[PDB]
DNA sequence: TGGAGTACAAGTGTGAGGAAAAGTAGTTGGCGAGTAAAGCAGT
């Protein structure tokens, strides 16, 4: 395994990682307020029963290595 | 002005760890009554 991370779909996600910090930490424009971030993660960390979410709940089950895999108690 | 490198960032040389079903163990258990005669002992 060459440690260049030359996979194409792998590198799209880092572009989605570095953007979401830069567009929020350096915001002189005060268009993205802090209280909306306080209404994002509080509304995102919230379970629901759609079939995408139910199907996502199966995916947490199958992987045993990492934490946030014994998430079934909640 | 221009070099000692020392750093992170690129590389390639060196054997093994984890996966699993069928097949293979040591171990119990669960079988198939008469009426007659002659013989040689007997003494």
Nucleotide nearest to A4 (CA to C1'): B10
- The distance (Å) linking the CA of A2 with the C1' of B37 is 123
State the method. cryo-EM
Measure CA of the first residue to CA of the last residue in chain A; give whole Å: 37
Tell me which residue has tokens 């960390």: A45
CA–CA distance, A4 with A40 (Å, rounded to integer)? 34
**Sequence-separated (6 or more) residues with CB below 8 Å from residue A53:** A47
Cβ neighbours for A11, distance < 8 A, ≥ 6 positions apart:
A5
Distance CA A27, CA A70 (A): 36
Give the CA A32 to C1' B14 distance in Å. 53
**Resolution of this entry, Å:** 3.5
């Amino acid at each position: 395994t060459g440690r260049v991370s030359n996979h194409a779909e792998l590198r799209v996600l880092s572009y989605f990682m570095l953007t979401i910090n830069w567009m929020l930490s350096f915001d002189r424009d005060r268009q993205y307020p802090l209280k909306w971030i306080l209404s994002l993660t509080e509304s995102l960390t919230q379970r629901t029963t759609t079939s995408e979410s139910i199907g996502r709940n199966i995916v947490k089950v199958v992987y045993p290595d990492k934490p946030t895999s014994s998430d079934y108690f909640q």
